[PDB]
Amino acid sequence: LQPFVNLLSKATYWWMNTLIISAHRKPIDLKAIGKLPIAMRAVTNYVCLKEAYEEQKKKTPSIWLAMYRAFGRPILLSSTFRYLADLLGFAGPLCISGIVQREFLENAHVLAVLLFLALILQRTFLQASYYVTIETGINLRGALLAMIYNKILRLSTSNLSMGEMTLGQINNLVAIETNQLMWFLFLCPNLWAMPVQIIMGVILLYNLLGSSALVGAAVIVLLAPIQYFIATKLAEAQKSTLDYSTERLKKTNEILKGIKLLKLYAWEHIFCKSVEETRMKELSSLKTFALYTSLSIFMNAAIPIAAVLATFVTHAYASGNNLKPAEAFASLSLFHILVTPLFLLSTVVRFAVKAIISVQKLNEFLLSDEIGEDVAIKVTNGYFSWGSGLATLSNIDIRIPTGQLTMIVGQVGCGKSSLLLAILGEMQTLEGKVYWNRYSVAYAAQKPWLLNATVEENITFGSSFNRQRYKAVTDACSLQPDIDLLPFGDQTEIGERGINLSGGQRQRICVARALYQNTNIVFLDDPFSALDIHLSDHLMQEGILKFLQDDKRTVVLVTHKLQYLTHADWIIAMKDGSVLREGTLKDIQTKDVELYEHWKTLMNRQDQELEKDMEADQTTLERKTLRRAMYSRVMRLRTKMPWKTCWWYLTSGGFFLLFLMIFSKLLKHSVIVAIDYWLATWTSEYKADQTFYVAGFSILCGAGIFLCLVTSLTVEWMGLTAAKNLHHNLLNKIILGPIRFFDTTPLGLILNRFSADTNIIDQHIPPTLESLTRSTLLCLSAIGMISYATPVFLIALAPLGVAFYFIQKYFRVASKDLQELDDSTQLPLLCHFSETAEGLTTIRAFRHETRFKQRMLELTDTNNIAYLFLSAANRWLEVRTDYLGACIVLTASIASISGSSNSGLVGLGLLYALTITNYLNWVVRNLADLEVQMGAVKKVNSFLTMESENYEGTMDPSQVPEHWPQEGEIKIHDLCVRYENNLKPVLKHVKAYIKPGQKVGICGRTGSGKSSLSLAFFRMVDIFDGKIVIDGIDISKLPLHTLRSRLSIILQDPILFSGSIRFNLDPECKCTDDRLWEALEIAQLKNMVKSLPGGLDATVTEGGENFSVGQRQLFCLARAFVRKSSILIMDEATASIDMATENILQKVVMTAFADRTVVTIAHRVSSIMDAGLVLVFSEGILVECDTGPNLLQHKNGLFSTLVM
């Protein structure tokens, strides 16, 4: 009995049962799920698929043949199960005909029991086929991901091969093409099962109804081309909507990062309107998409009705016999059977075409350019090239002594990085040989590569953690001062996803990773490129010379700092892809005196140039940015369906639309039941005159078609209205919020609310709601009609319904976990592939390909097990609801046979009992989908219920003059500034009198509250005591727009917004082009604008990447001059700016802004030694407020110490 119970457990998915039941007790996690079986692990499937692919390559290789030879037998098994289920599905109409007709097989109860058994077997076989094909598709996805990851690990990094689009193509293959191929393998048995089922259904219809059934067969067969055409139009409209949504999301992201500047300039509403224009275009495209969706729904619901109408009218007239209940309702059952394959065969064909495209892309990727197969390293007569045939490195003959520092020196473009990568084997070897006396190399690439992991996980890089070595490595690279600034320290997730670091910090972290590894050979490729003199010298003295010589490492150091050549044991001088001369410094000097003299001249010139420029500190400005970035730093609910969120979404389109949808759907399903009952009455008159019944049937069918159209239009109209209203409210609501909200909430969360939740509301919810309402109404009408035919069925409705409740309860939570789990596993795996595409040279130099292969296999196995268990929960639910439906069919059949009203009613009840089995599962599935989507609607509403700023001022706008800050007086009385309630005040008792047209310089130590004062000028920070009176008007008693739009501010990092230069200068477009040209000339920028095509309407890239940072700062100066505020705030504007551009900025401020009151937070204190009023801040307290010379003459003063 053990094999029998094992087979039953497999067939009913009983092994999921416990995992479902536990979902109420505790959330489902990866620990609750087991591991993948050996036959299901990605490694075994990868080996099978790779063996098949290599067999094909032996013989151009066929991916399709490899997939068939690897994962073909399970497809044949699932096809056998699908054919058995299709055959056992036609027992429905046959048993309906037999029962309605009323030796042994003639018995009606025998036929009812046989129909029950046939339904149970059919559903078991169908779910088995679904599970087998889904498992095979998941195995194929794992194998394909492993194959493409190995191909990635083999990829060549040359610019000819590894282009800028290669990483995007890899991401597309991992995230899209592999999933398209997996879904095609999911749906492939349909491709040869649906045609057979359709042909057999048409044959059964013909056997039932003569040639009259061929008319309905043709009409309903017309549904497949119509659905294919409608799906083509849907794809086109979806691409259009996706383009418009991408533009809208680009604009929204540009607003969100940079919202502080927009609020300071009071340009938030202009950018909101700019986003709303793109939103309106996207909404028009979405309207076309919804129109085609409603067409699809209407056709799916109306072609069957027209086919039934044509069939039965043609039978009433052409056929000489009366319509019989058995034939009529068996044919109705056959039509209902045929609807689904005809509607979904177009989907299967579309997936087949997309799979052909995906296999073409995958096969074109699997055929890509890939890398080829004392003294530690020696190159003899080496001729290397980057794949173009032209040798980049010609006649390379070098020697790298073991355990000695080797420095490669040459001008930019010599081929030093090329020499290192040719030694590592990353480029083609035309001639020569590289001898290693390969081996693992600690490689620090010229472009630093960071994993999306913590600082410690980047530095250790798959190596055992040693605290002494880790501390020594961190000290040598001077990483502790900037690690301490990180929120979590070593455990701070850095990289693309995590905290953004400066180029110098990333370079030092990669150098630390190179130093930490205990490999005898270290390759450093310009490690001082993004560092300053002090950090470079410390790394050279402690890391290269001390730490790397304690371990006796063979160090190869590509550098431009020739001053370090005195520390070199071996020197390799390059020029134009060839070595001029190699050897010790003394040997080079003796043999090649000219090269030594040239090196001396270069060292002297570099020292002379750096002597003046050493004043600027790169590391100080990196650490200040990193420190400023950190200034800001349920069981009952699990099963609670969000009915309030559902009601809010339904009423967000208006009560008329909701009423129209509900009324139209109720009327449509009433009419459908009416046509079924009319057929019942017509057949129960069984040649009489058919005119009355034909006329009534035609009228009912026409009304049903019209109501199908009405409901299809109405649900999509409601969805469009709700989406429009929700997004329109959301954008404006979040923009008006305080700056503290944007400082606290990450940009990722807000952008998710604007992209993913918006897409869910726009395109996912309307179809889910339509399907849920349709399935629920079909089930309710079926139950009502079965109970009307036989009231005793209601007795069995109490148990079965109760069962249904539990079946819908547990599933609705279990899947909710599994889906989430699936998502939590999709993000890492994809990221892994990206981390391997960029950083491939580092991985292959460290020789850590095996570790990354293992990590990829783990990630894909986790993703596959999550997806498999989600699908298994779906199969569990389908089996449960299918057995419920079989019980319903058996009960209805027995009740109808025992107590018969008439033959037509028996047939009608049997048909409805048979049909409810299809929709019971979809009621639960759509309810779960609706709950998931209402989660996103709840997120959007939560963002919509946030608190905004107080944009309405106390003062009467008539009281405020037209030119309010005309003079520029400022009076700060007992100012107490905090960034949020319950936090400590950041400014305490600041009192100052800024004379109109007086140049004020604000200075102090880091964290003293200088930027907080500039924010208090704009009321971007919470003032709770004291006041700021600007030109006689308290700014607290003022609208925020009037205050912020009449004051000019210049921040440190300049930000320009995508659009025209005229748009950047004034989005409001109040000024004239002559004024804009005058401002551009003032900012010493008119010639640059003239050089650009179009002048004032030259396109600015997002962030202003077209212009240099100095040009961006000059643009900010031009905007400030356009504003004509007479009060200009400059928050360390000259920082991160070239010295020449800094002098230009100072000249512009002195000349053009001579009249305006300039309040400058000096980046360099010496710049405000001659300022009229100097405000010195210490720890939030105004220590000194006097003239510059007055503070200078007072010895031992804070300003005097700052100046020195």
Ligand SMILES: CCOc1cc(CC(=O)N[C@@H](CC(C)C)c2ccccc2N2CCCCC2)ccc1C(=O)O
């Ligand atoms: C992850 C794969 O998920 C499945 C995968 C399958 C495999 C399958 O032959 N589908 C047939 C469905 C039946 C009605 C023919 C089909 C055919 C064409 C288009 C879509 C579909 N189906 C696609 C999935 C959702 C239901 C319509 C079954 C069921 C599921 C499921 O979600 O439970």
Ligand SMILES: Nc1ncnc2c1ncn2[C@@H]1O[C@H](COP(=O)(O)OP(=O)(O)OP(=O)(O)O)[C@@H](O)[C@H]1O
């Ligand atoms: N990945 C690559 N694929 C193809 N060609 C490349 C690649 N990297 C560099 N080259 C080319 O090979 C030549 C050698 O330049 P390379 O980058 O090796 O010099 P370098 O001395 O390291 O220069 P730099 O000081 O600018 O870093 C140049 O013509 C360069 O354009």
Ligand SMILES: Nc1ncnc2c1ncn2[C@@H]1O[C@H](COP(=O)(O)OP(=O)(O)OP(=O)(O)O)[C@@H](O)[C@H]1O
């Ligand atoms: N966004 C913020 N949220 C909360 N507190 C903040 C925020 N920004 C700054 N603070 C707090 O206010 C203090 C005042 O520093 P602030 O940035 O205002 O000016 P600062 O002294 O000129 O700074 P820095 O020299 O680093 O640019 C900070 O030390 C910090 O404690």
Ligand SMILES: [Mg+2]
């Ligand atoms: Mg280089």
Ligand SMILES: [Mg+2]
């Ligand atoms: Mg500051």
